[model samples]
Target chain A: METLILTQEEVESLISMDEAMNAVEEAFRLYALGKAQMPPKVYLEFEKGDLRAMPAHLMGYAGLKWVNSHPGNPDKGLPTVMALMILNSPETGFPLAVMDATYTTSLRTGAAGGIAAKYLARKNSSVFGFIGCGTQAYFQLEALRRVFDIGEVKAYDVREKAAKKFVSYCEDRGISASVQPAEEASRCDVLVTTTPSRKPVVKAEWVEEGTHINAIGADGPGKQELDVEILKKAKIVVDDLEQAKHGGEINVAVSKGVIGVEDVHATIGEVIAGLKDGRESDEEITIFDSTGLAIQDVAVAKVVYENALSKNVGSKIKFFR
Target chain B: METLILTQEEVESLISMDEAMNAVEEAFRLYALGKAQMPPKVYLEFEKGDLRAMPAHLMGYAGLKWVNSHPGNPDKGLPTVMALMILNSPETGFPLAVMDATYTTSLRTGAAGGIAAKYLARKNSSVFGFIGCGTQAYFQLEALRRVFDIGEVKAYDVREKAAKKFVSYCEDRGISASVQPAEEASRCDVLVTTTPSRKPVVKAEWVEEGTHINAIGADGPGKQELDVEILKKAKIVVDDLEQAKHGGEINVAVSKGVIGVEDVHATIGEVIAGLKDGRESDEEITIFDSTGLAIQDVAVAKVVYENALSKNVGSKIKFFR
Candidate 1:
């Protein structure tokens, strides 16, 4: 069977944050409706970092994403994270396309944060804050901009240059921006944390009453970027309860017995599917703990593959006889 | 990162049974010695069949194999199983190659069986028997022929034509051959069973004391081809204990309480690594319950990829930038 091959260049132009959010939101809804299949992520630990295998079945398609995190790879002219995904036919189990998923991973992750903020954050939210002013901060800003009309921005990072650069980046896009401390940034209407921090970077006392937090940094065990006290007071909604408890911002809190699984209000999917309530009151603090999902990648990948076929923008070769 | 793309045709010629056996045998040894890393296989089940994501690190390389089994595919003019593998660099987390793994799956599976027999079967064995004479039976026979001097062959299958065809295949290779019943087939010194049977096809009474069985067909849950009585007396060796108890030939036996995890003598790797003994005596009945390991696929994939690189045998595409 002939399989379509799409490189990063071809895939980059094939999707937008708007489309990614739509697809990912639908995927979350489908999963909560019990119409999707996803296995637990498989990890192969190495000396440098690790590799994760994620497989999912949704929207009449099945796919697998092979992603790796090598923090030292950047020194060797490589990104710390890279991903490749294979999309196959659910009926026949034939691989339809193989595509570079590094870009898609970033896009869908930002989309998840944006969608989470849509249902969790207050409707009048205008002031945005970013705790980690890296590449992921830009992605989050872009996706959030598509949803809310941001009036001001607070960018914070351990590196002064990164925080200043993020402020400039937002200012260039016509948003009022300022380099702020973690305390100042955490007081915004919606806050996004994207650092690779092991300990709390944002203090619980800094967060306001109506502020919603998108915990985007911790995707593996022993990695957290937020205060556990914030979790104790917030209505915790996770992307996946098992994954979040094991590796999300709630991981340390859960493992340390500071928070139990019962503290989790719901999965984001349950909210999207109308099975659980979103923000019930402005005074109730809410948090979206996203550890990432294979379904998000598959959903975005489906969009890319379909767009590639219609645009005739990829190479096709017979990989099997 | 430029990734080599090897089609089935190019990969088909790059490897043989001999190379695969050596690679797989070494992989098993490395795994037992704690020199290899492999995550448990992830499964995403569909209505038709299922897809498996197996990731392994061995011999300084890492790989992920995506394979599926859809039994009704033949009616649609496709094989029941198809696989693709991505070999990656552990240092930088870059994809090194993407190749067809259907042929490699078959070759490495046969190699595992042949290697198991060489260590567990009687050294003076001359007669070989196949209980399910299908495509896998031919592969098993080819690999076995490379190890021992086959003087006689017996084939048995539910389909008379398949049994007759397998007998002729052996006869064409200068071995004495005949079509026999399952009882007669199980009496050989080295028996290979490749049937997808839910119930025992080979009765304990039919098996000789010194016979070695390479259990090849029972790869999923609720599948077995040998009687529980045989496992009660045989030195049961498994490729992986978790996999064997969940899905291999021993799955049904273990689930039905006919056998327990304690009955498993050792992993095939333990025997290969010299951590345990293999075939203590000529009269010992040995059964190698192979659900198949991701390490075996990675071992064979390394050979194919290296050969392709040296021979300049496949297309290269820049998948990551």
Candidate 2:
């Protein structure tokens, strides 16, 4: 068996935000229709870091994303989150591609945000706000631009330079942008929170009615981005019910008895599959709690693999004897 | 970051059975001493197959094995089990190596068998019996040769040609060998059962007292190679208590109430770490139910990676932008 090897740069060039959004949307629909298999993320925890395995089988493709989140990595001049993906043949159990997943992780995650905004946000949403101007924030902006005719971009970060860099990036893309405080960023028509914060950063009064929020930061226990007061007043949709209830923004609130599992309206998949309503009215404030999913990675990886194969971009080498 | 890519043949040439055995033994000891982090295996089930991700971090090394087992793969001229591994840098979360895990999986599993036999089997045991003459049977023979001075080899398989081939293999290694019936194979001092049998194939009466058995085949639910009666009278040890109780040979017997968890004395790690006794009495029958572990793979892979690096035997390519 031969496996195609791809680099982060190669994968970045192979997949586009539009393609990623379409792929992730379809994966969610398949999951909602019971056509995909995804196990909950498995964690191997250490004192300083943790490794997580996310495995999924969807659309006749089987693969896993091996990702790590080490808090001490930044000091070593490495990203806090690094990932690699293996796409395999479901029929013969042969690995088809082994590629850098850090880029795909951000792309798919941002695509999920776009999909959420497309379904849960009002159709006329134009202004976009970002709370964390990191690598993920760039992809989120790229993915959202594919789905909306954006006019203004609002950015905020603890590091003022990061916010300024993000604003300059948006301006380079010919979109009017500005650096703002966290409160100001929360007031956009569509707001995305992508910080690594354990305490609430987005408050209820800061977010206006009819705005859609993509809560993208809180992925594990002891992590939160939105105030519980905001969750209590909004219709919350999660990427995965079990995951959101355990590790998403809802985890803290649900654990404190601020809200029950019954309060979650539906999974993003259900909305994508049209099995449940997405946005009830323009006046409704909606929130998409994105804990991320294996299906999203597998779906975007399939696109990258197919594109690489057609373009003959990645190196293919014999994996077996 | 650059990732080293190793093919199955390259990996097979880099590490020996002795190295794997030593590495795996140390891994077991580390696991026993609570110095390793291993998450329970995560399964993504499909209609015709299942994908499993086993991740572990031990002794400053972190890695995961993505493996799959498809029952229908043999018809397509592919092995039922296929795997790939990602070895990562613990400090920076960067992938250090991406390699085919097919050969490593077999080697580590075989090393595990050797480790179990070393601790549980009598020190001077010579005669070895194998009930299944497949690819794994070959590695089992290789590993056992590292631990014991085997003088005779007994082999049996439902396929007569496989048994004959195994006999020839043993003869080439300068060991007295013969093809025998299943009953005859069960009478040796050390017996290994490696077939994917769902029912009891080795009867209780067939196994002699004081014999050490490596139950290597039953790795999933509803698969058992040894009779419940044999377990009732033997000192049963397992690789992992939870895994063995759920999917190893003990799973069936324990589920039927023939034996409780108390009857299973110790994990192989415990015996290796000297926390518990192994083969205390020459007259007691010993059984080691092997449910393979991720730590074993990580240990062996670290050896392979270090060897490959020292010898410059694998292709290294950029993984990040």
Candidate 3:
């Protein structure tokens, strides 16, 4: 017998957006079914950025996640976030793969947004607005394209060049959407925000009724994009209550007295599992707060394991007896 | 340039008993210098086994560890414990290697025993005894081999086959220990108990003056190996007081009113850092509690990173911009 060992290239070879999406969905299903075991991640905030260790074991997959958030990295010509994921064998407790989680994280996170939209957004929703034209915004758009028939997209960022790059990249990626400024883009029925700024970006007056917003950013304490006043009328749903209390968008909103814990009607996992309905009415605004979870890593890890095996994407090593 | 991708075989190829000892020693040095960051490990215990997650970060290494403890595994032809070590890149927060932690854990733990002896034992001590001749016992002997010039080694286990095997393995490894039964082994100057029994295995009458005993196996509430009478006379040391209070050898002693938390002279790390002295008298009996710590993992992880780099071990995957 051989010990499977996956490298970065092999891991990349084994993963795709579609497959990663499926993995996240499966992981969420496992959580909803009460089969996943994940502890709250510990976040260490530094002056420059933050570091986190997220650990999870679910459905025969164990993952150790090390991810960092350094918003100032772009100034140093580096990506804002860098991450790694380790997949271990549950049977023998040996590591099966060590892969770059930067891309995997973006992919899985985007897929999660897509899953939320599938449950929370109105059917046939077309127009979309994206705030922050960074790497995360790209994936959110791609994921929305996968979940909804997004006929048009309007993007807003402080950097015009970055927005233009994003627009061109979307065109190349076959997303038939028009990119415009934030003030004009606010008219869309679906909105996605992926910024690290602490200040509010999307005003309450700009948002229309019957809109769904994927709160992808504002994941850490005191970081938010959308106005909390809008949360008053929206049917708020969170990723995890414990996580939301410390750092999610709900954390900020709750701390600011804009909404209480009781304001959250359901978690996305519960909604997906049919314990609760997502969008009660077409005219009701829906907000999905995504703080990210370690369960997603476990899900993606299982996918990487099976894909690597079927594709013969990794090397086999000897077990020392 | 081709990216470095380390297969499991490649990672295994670089680790040996000698390397493991070195890693542990270096880890101790780093921990003594206050260069390690470790959160307390969380544990979930069961009737036959236990599960734990240890998260740590050193100057250069980042890891989340998952390990299991099954006391009856040996009886079922399995290792009693298994662990996984994930090493990540501090520069980009990407995983560089995910390696088998079972062997790593045993080796590091044994090295820790040796380190405790270095701090607590009288110089020029020669005789050693081991109880519970499982895989951990073998490593303990191996670790002592590196630090002490011992004339004989004696071991005892409830299972005669395991004791015989331990003796035979010691002979094969050129340790030259004269293995004997538990009663005969109890007379040695250095003793270690790694069994998971709820009752005392080493009574106070069996111990002699100036004996340096490493009490390592009792890691859960109500589990103990040494009689409370010995704790009354011994200069006691622990890994972490808070951790030991929950389920360590000292916890057992403390509950019996043999010793109080304030009676603890120093932690092993404090002793190693020269903040406290050990064995001031030639007739002093010393006991070093080895419940383990998260910082030890951090320390060893940093060493593993250095060793991996020096040996050109592990894989590197390209993360795109």
Task: For each candidate in the order shown, give its overall lDDT on alpha carbons.
Answer: 0.92, 0.89, 0.75
lDDT of 2 by residue, A1-321 (tens): 578989898998999889999999999999999999888788777668877889999978999998999989878777788888899888777889988899899889999998999899989898889989988788878888888989899999999999999999889989999999998899989998999789998888999989999989887887999989999999999999988888898999999999999999999999989899989978889999998899999999999999999999988889875
Model 3 ranges with Cα > 4 A deviation: A7-22, A43-51, A70-79, A89-94, A171-176, B1-34, B42-51, B68-80, B89-91, B161-177, B255-258, B311-321
Top candidate on lDDT is 1
> List-wise, what DockQ does each model earn?
0.72, 0.68, 0.31
Model 2, position A5: C-alpha lDDT score: 89
Reference-based lDDT, residue A87, model 2: 93
Kindly list the per-residue Cα lDDT of model 3 for residues B1-321, writing each as its tens digit.
122444435545556656666666566656667776676675543446656778776656666666777767667666667666655545544445555566567767888888788778888788889989977787788787778887677888999889888878877876677658767788778898899779988888888888898888887888998888888888888877877777888787788776898888888877877778867987888988887776566556556656677987765545343
DockQ (C-alpha) of model 3?
Answer: 0.31
Mind listing the fnat for each candidate? 0.67, 0.67, 0.12
Candidate 2 local accuracy as lDDT? 0.89
Docking class of 1: medium
Query: Would you give me the overall lDDT of model 1?
Result: 0.92
The model with the greater TM-score, 1 or 3, is 1
